[PDB]
Amino acid sequence: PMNQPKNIFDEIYQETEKTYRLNNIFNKLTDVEVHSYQEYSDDSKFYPSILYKDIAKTGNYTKIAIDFSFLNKNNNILIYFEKEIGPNVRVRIWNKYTRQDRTLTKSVKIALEKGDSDKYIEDETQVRAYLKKYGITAKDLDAHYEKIVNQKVLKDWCSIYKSKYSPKDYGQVTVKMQWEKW
């Protein structure tokens, strides 16, 4: 009552924190696997991480995941996904909702595949050079975000939880997009 969700990301965060030790709400979503990974700050605890199953991934999308950080000072949900954009190169679109300032920050990174390993690139100038090389515009980034975050991840949430929000009306949330002027 005192701390009801103010937007769809609060709703996901709070219902997952309420259920992840008892019977994770995402057990209800058949397209994903639920994982438990060791918390860095408390050796006695695990955080939940959601990974879309291969059956549930489309076209060039290689990964779709939701990580929950409940224990740290900048606690948050992170929804991210990755798509191949050229030979040995993937774009990663990174959408982090920070609880303490009710802010969703959308950003773009690059992964370079060098055989076994990935090398990760986040510096804005380098990222934009890769995007320009492979012809990815800000409008393309919006379309990828709409397709995966709104039409898949958040639509999936609304299929397992009776949301007070929706993929087209997030609620009260400050949205900051790295590529807004690109």
Numbering used by the authors: 22 to 203
Original paper wording:
In addition to the WXG100 protein EsxA, we demonstrated that the T7SS of S. intermedius exports three effector proteins named TelA, TelB and TelC. While the mode of action of TelA is unknown, biochemical characterization of TelB demonstrated that it exerts toxicity by degrading the electron carrying dinucleotide NAD+, whereas TelC functions as a phosphatase that cleaves peptidoglycan precursor lipid II.
In contrast to cells expressing TipC1, we found that TipC2 expression could not prevent toxicity caused by constitutive expression of the TelC toxin domain (TelCtox) targeted to the inner wall zone of SiB196 (ss-TelCtox). The resulting electron density maps allowed for complete model building of TipC2ΔTMD (residues 23–203) and a vector-encoded proline residue derived from the linker region connecting a his6-tag to the N-terminus of TipC2ΔTMD. TipC2ΔTMD adopts a mixed α/β fold consisting of three α-helices and seven β-strands that fold together to give the protein a distinct crescent-shaped appearance. This shape is characterized by a concave surface formed by a seven-stranded β-sheet and a convex surface generated by the positions of three α-helices. The resulting TipC1ΔTMD model (residues 23–204) had a template modeling score of 0.65, indicating that the probability that our TipC1ΔTMD model has the same overall topology and fold as TipC2ΔTMD is greater than 95%.
